[PDB]
Amino acid sequence: GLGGYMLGSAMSRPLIHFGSDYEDRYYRENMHRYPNQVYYRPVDQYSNQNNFVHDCVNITVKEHTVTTTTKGENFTETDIKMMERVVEQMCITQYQRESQAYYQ
């Protein structure tokens, strides 16, 4: 039943900066192997910003690792650090979209 979560529609993957020009293509040339949809709750439930984001990160990162590892892909430790910020950024965006229309 995937607990009882909400998964969003496909997201714009932000070009988050790092520093090494390597990582900028290690991102771009590789976008498709990192997520574009994160797994969360409506702003109703886990009614925080970053404390919802950490669960969204944890669930998405963990669902995606297992699945993609079970398809014969490996992740480097910087792939973890570059996935986490991308996942947090996109998930933050998906909450903020809702709360900004809740309020308006």
Side-chain angles (χ1 to χ4, degrees):
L2 216 174
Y5 288 99
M6 295 189 105
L7 158 70
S9 23
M11 294 153 130
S12 318
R13 286 189 185 102
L15 245 77
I16 313 193
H17 15 269
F18 305 95
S20 297
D21 335 297
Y22 223 111
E23 276 160 266
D24 216 297
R25 281 124 81 79
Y26 219 78
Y27 191 59
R28 273 183 270 172
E29 282 265 65
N30 297 266
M31 283 197 139
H32 300 256
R33 63 155 60 244
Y34 312 144
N36 57 279
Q37 297 170 237
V38 305
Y39 294 85
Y40 58 105
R41 247 75 186 308
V43 317
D44 281 41
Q45 285 271 285
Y46 294 132
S47 158
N48 264 138
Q49 189 243 305
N50 264 331
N51 206 270
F52 107 80
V53 181
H54 182 57
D55 280 47
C56 180
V57 172
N58 182 64
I59 293 288
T60 306
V61 167
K62 187 226 61 60
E63 275 297 297
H64 190 100
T65 44
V66 179
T67 301
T68 305
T69 290
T70 307
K71 278 171 169 264
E73 295 289 11
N74 29 279
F75 289 119
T76 29
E77 176 177 323
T78 294
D79 281 10
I80 319 300
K81 258 70 286 219
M82 86 195 298
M83 81 177 55
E84 263 211 32
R85 288 208 297 132
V86 159
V87 175
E88 105 164 350
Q89 264 295 300
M90 299 189 289
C91 212
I92 277 164
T93 296
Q94 222 72 306
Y95 168 90
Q96 272 168 33
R97 275 164 167 282
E98 273 295 293
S99 290
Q100 289 167 6
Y102 204 130
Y103 269 71
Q104 214 290 113

